[model samples]
Target: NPKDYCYSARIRSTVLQGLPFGGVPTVLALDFMCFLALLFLFSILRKVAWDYGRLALNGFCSWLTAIFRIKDDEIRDKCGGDAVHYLSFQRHIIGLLVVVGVLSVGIVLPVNFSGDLLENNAYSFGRTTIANLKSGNNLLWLHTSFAFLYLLLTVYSMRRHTSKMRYKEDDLVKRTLFINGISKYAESEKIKKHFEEAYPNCTVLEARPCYNVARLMFLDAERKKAERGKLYFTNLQSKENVPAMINPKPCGHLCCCVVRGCEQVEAIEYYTKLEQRLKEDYRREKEKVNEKPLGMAFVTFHNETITAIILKDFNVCKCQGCTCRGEPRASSCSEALHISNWTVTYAPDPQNIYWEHLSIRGFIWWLRCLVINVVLFILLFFLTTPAIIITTMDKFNVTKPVEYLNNPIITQFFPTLLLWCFSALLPTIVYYSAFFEAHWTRSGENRTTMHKCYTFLIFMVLLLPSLGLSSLDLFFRWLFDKKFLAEAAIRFECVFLPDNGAFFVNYVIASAFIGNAMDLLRIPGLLMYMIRLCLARSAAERRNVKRHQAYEFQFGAAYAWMMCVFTVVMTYSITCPIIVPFGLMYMLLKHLVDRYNLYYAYLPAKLDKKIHSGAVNQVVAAPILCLFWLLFFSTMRTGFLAPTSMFTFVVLVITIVICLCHVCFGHFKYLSAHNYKIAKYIAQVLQD
Candidate 1:
């Protein structure tokens, strides 16, 4: 019956390859037409299903509410509105829906459709099961089209969201500037006066001196020791009233007594003196004027227009002798204060400031970055080594020593479980590296962390596992003299690479189910909090722990996951078109989850105006990934090698052209016009 259906459409087994079907050009045109029709049908069906499903659910809920006279104000308030709204917008609900949708469509549907085709195919060296689909060429075209569409959709969504946030009045960072490389002669007041005179219309709100690093370190050390002493005294006092016998002691004559005479009083006196010393240090530091400033200042303006203008022209002082212009000497002002040496950028939200790192010198900061990068590289290599070894050993059919792991349950589930564990651990490592080592703005740190995490996920989670497995298979086959190294490498490209789609399907399914569940439960976070609470020795420490418990979801981690999903989809879209639906589901669900989480669970951690830049950069990764896949398949032995290679080449050129256009358009439309447009609008509003 299936043969009859496929034959009726002029699609024979030979036609599935690059062989002529009636005629080559005619067959190509027909295949392209059928592909477009299927794409249209899928789009319509998906949209209709999404819309009607939402409506039906909403209607059913309304009917139930009407039938049952349940009018509870508390319940309604807690739900945030109607049942439909609550269900649609809930953070966990959206995430769960996405996971379910991806599993069902992306993982399940494709496997069900293509499994028989894959299994029945001969396991030959040069031919792949992927190139034998009835509409393989059409599917490749569809994949390419969808990749472009995904990029367009991402850019549109980012622009829409960023436009809303860019003009908010309450965002003071838009009106602020961070100036570095202040001259030694330039005091805060002097700098403020100079800026105010430079722009008469602008106002210098306030200027605060940057804390000296040496003094800050001393203060921190003293405060920590004092606090520890206070806690020790408090613990002693609490137990002082207890009976000596009840407190218990060693029975032997050589053992020391558990309680000493008046040691509690002595601790209390020592802590008291420490407290007094700490207060004196703080007072002395505060009273000291003309303190050694860190040569940085956050300057604020009343209007964004003024700030934008200042940013365009804000440079080192080159003023000659005049009443308003002070004498600029070479000794008092280092060449470091020149426009080339000075750095200026928009300030971040005051609340998001990491003040301690601001005083770190350039060379020290560079060293920190170098160390963190080395540590990160080592961490990624170690984390991926186990998965790589296991996958490779399994691929080579050489598991006699570790045959116990050949059990279906272990083979099927263990790799996925390992990946999930690594995914969970990655965010913390990335967060700490960014927080401690990078001399970037808070928002910049988050962006940098996202880039780092994406790189790691690609290598560790996606590429390394597959590459290592393939490499090991090739090495073992060559070792046994079954083939030469070059022939084995070709076998890897044609056979092993195409066959590995099933593994990735399992990966996606596990990630959607297990990973999403862990995010919702946050069990690890809860356990960490409990551990901290139990270990806290003082009320102050307890309070600090409580404050830290307000978990602000990292935007970097979220961005990395989104990019990872996109990469996975792009990598397998042509080879495994079934993954496209899962990719769509993952991205759609992630968008909804992010919206709800950003509003409810996560604290606003970014203060930069170019909010959409990260999204644009993320979209760039998808096309580059597509390009890699194109080049990869071009070198492999697909059944329709000539046609597939030509199609991929054309698609590659088009992708490059489109990407260039996107960059130019975004630059002119968003980046260049951003601050100027706001400034113009504000001026007009004032004039009116």
Candidate 2:
């Protein structure tokens, strides 16, 4: 199993390939769209094709190789398997060829065939399922069914593989095995020789200084006991210390042998001489303890205590002053013993314990990830559910022609007001749970009560005003008729924006006042945080203190400053009015305050954190923001400004394009460094 730790790639590729719609027409459509968009974008920008061409080429070629039964054994050994593993190469080739071919066919094929293409004709390798979905069939239900079938098949296949008749062959190496199990002394040569004779198909290489590490003949067939051969220990540890060995061709079996060290080999031949000398030295040392007033305590291990030692973690220190008292005096048992009164240090193994153990824990982590994804999906559905409902109602003409405008739910402010409440509350709950569950703060203290309280407060903050509105609305409706409500609404709208000229006048006036206020609040905070950080750094650097102490001073100061600023801002922000105009003003205030975060001291090291976490990919935010901006301009200025604003929107698109390049480059740089943790964080940030 260890010899062939090469199935990982195959598993990943197989899983990716197993997606039901991977080879579907829609996939090709999407791929083509992506290809055209990228090509155009690149052509306009005057940049290299970003290797997409090569990726596509390799993908198609790999698929072809798989289809035609071509194998690259040398390449496989170097990078992994051909078909199951490294499918990306094949995927790239397929994508490249398909894109090229599709483009060519588009140029050459008659326009009359377009109808057939759109119809998903069976004669042209098109499937009807996509068309059915386009025709309003239950596509998601079908997807789920297929996924369940795939799951069943996957389970069955794994079971069959495991249940096949098999034998314990020599190629299997216990990765977690400890070294002390086997000795490499001359006296054990016969056992070593027997091992060699027993595994003739395998070569036994000696591990002198190292123990318990070897290879074995890994065959799936039976072997006669006498026919098995053994290999003996030879040259000890050399400069080239390879982790493993392999053969190029099929063998009856695979085998491994351990190497021994020079000192161990010598000691095995002179054990009695060493024991006699040690006994003589022990007898002399027993009578000679000149009592240096012992602040230090020593513990010795007897045969009875050895079993306990075997179970405990061992220290591999060479210092005579080491604190390894093997029994009751031991501080901890891991890789080393520790002393509370002083520092205890030792080198530890470099092999990753977490990565090695991930195979066991990955599934649980993956489940948690799936649950988080489902929560996010539900939240998204909730946010856009109202729009979908509204659109569907509009399409079906659900409202009565005569009474639709007059219906209380439609005519009154309460329904829209209620819808707004639901929209805000759903995201609020999701955001609260996300932050709390993720434990965003690095407190090392899980203040779950505090987290829950914060969530409750945020909910209250968002909902309390809506509840007040509801109560106020009921009060007004109970006392007034439709005429009074209509009069009040007209008056409110007049006061809010007035005529087109008045709206522009008000917007300009409001922008100046709010923008100035923003500058005042943000600029000061920016200066303060910057100055504080500079002073703290300077003062700490001047002082001769321990690293931890210095870190505490800096981090504590920053934390306190941030907490104070947050308290002040929240307290002031809560006093604002609830009207739409005032809400816009408050939003300006928040934006201005956010501008303060541009300061280095207040800023995160990675800008991707802010971008990714800003609901950049939210289904509604972009469309709503764009629509609102358009409406604002159209109402205040004229419809003429809409086209100009749209043009500005296109300009902003270019800006975003540039920013995306930087963002993706940063992401790629992080990923290429093998920092998957940081890469995932960046990805989530971008998703935000």
Candidate 3:
């Protein structure tokens, strides 16, 4: 069965190469299958090599540097610190050795085996298949051998470190347990043993109820501290108040009862000093001990702390000649300490672990991305070869064996060409983006602004060429009396509908379908527009809050009305003959731009509550607009205009009405929202 499956797989690959009769769905399926297979293999390899290997390698390197005094400077210079680069060198060496060995064997034996290798005998098929299987096994062995070699290298280098740098109390909590202040003794391994030893049927759940109870107690304590002595108004802002600003205001923003009152100045100052000292201590501990040719550096800040660790093993050294030499007693010391038996731990609050995880996860993620891209490159490279071979075969169709198929399916032409073009274009976007911004260079403070600017810039970049070319195409078509479009239409017709049977039906439907396809891009374009709108609104909201000491509650309401009216009009206009095709192109370009550079970060509990309230407004608005568009399109009169004067005038009137409604509604809503915000802010600032 396995043999049969292998044979079928080979046949399938050959069939895909030979046959091009299937439509878009069939080709897309094949593309997806190949990509999926490659993706799976890449994911497996990444986990095996990068994710797991990183923990082991970094641990090993930490020990190695400590035990042997192998400073990072030496590792940086000699070993090539980037794991990908290191892997590349290893692969290159393997390739060179394999090539040299093969060449030597070839030179030594000079035997003519072409006839034997291809001979159509009883042994030929079986022998060929056996040889192919053996070759696959051999290549697999080579791959496994390399992976093992690298793993061994990693393990061997950090062998001293693994025993020394066992996950510490904080590290154990932050890395594995996902609970802050969780003692190492309460880790999964210990808990499992405790459960096993406690009772025959004792489960982890039964044994860990204590842990949950403890966590709740911890949360309760935190909540109590957060809610301590806040000014309370029972009658002024009751629970029944609609659109309630739940928290009642005090004249001087006092947290405690004015009668018994405020914390003593000394106690307040002491608490502030304690908090500042704790923050400073946390910052110092998290700071990277910069060894020249530092194997890694980690920086953490904000409530959501992230710790980035970069590991390299080129020319690591601990000499004064290293990159991070500094004064001996500097408060923020960056000296490379001997870390042979160092047990590194970073246990910030469990709630803030996303940042810490993001750092290590980002490195692993980028590595996987690199591997996936490389795998795609290989598959695409092979895919293109088949096309070239097929073309050559077509040229030699008059020849005996080559005459097996005279003409391939027509749909093949477009997909094959498009795939090739897209394959080339896809890499360009990634390459350019990567070239400009290295994976770990961005900061949280800049992320929002960077995302907005990049989204706008990239959208322009992707569209500018297409827009320019489309403009050129239009210019030439108009200048040449629509010759280009006419010629294109004829070719399209020939490919889509060969005979004149129902030709007009095909033509009209095809035009509408093309327009609809273009219009589909409106979805992503709308999403992009929403992203921009959200960014602008958030910035505006923050500005208003700062300057006027109030939130603009009506901002959301006005945006909702404008979106509703705009969508309704756009749907009708798009279905019209004149705008359909051009609308499609416009939507396509706009959507493509919008889909790029999207980013979102989690907010703190307090901030999240505010965002949730604001997002409710967006949720209500988005659906109303979307629903309006859907209903409008479903019920609209979409047939082409009749020749009658009365019908034409009615059509003109409808068009004008739609356009006027859209402009008036859009402007009115915007102005109303803007004025509402301005007025609300002024009132808040002047409030008693």
lDDT of each: 0.50, 0.27, 0.27
| Candidate 1 lDDT over residue span 273-302, tens digit each | 768888777667655624666767777777
Global lDDT for candidate 1? 0.50
Clashes of 2: 47
lDDT of 3 by residue, 458-507 (tens): 22222111112112233244347736533333222221111111121122
Q: In candidate 3, how many Å is residue 255 off?
A: 63
TM-score for all predictions?
A: 0.63, 0.21, 0.21
Show where candidate 2 strays beyond 4 Å: 1-363, 382-417, 435-584, 587-650, 666-688
Residue 522, candidate 3: C-alpha displacement in angstroms: 24
How far does residue 558 in candidate 2 sit from its true spot (Å)? 18
Misplaced by over 4 Å in model 3 are 1-29, 45-471, 474-476, 479-688
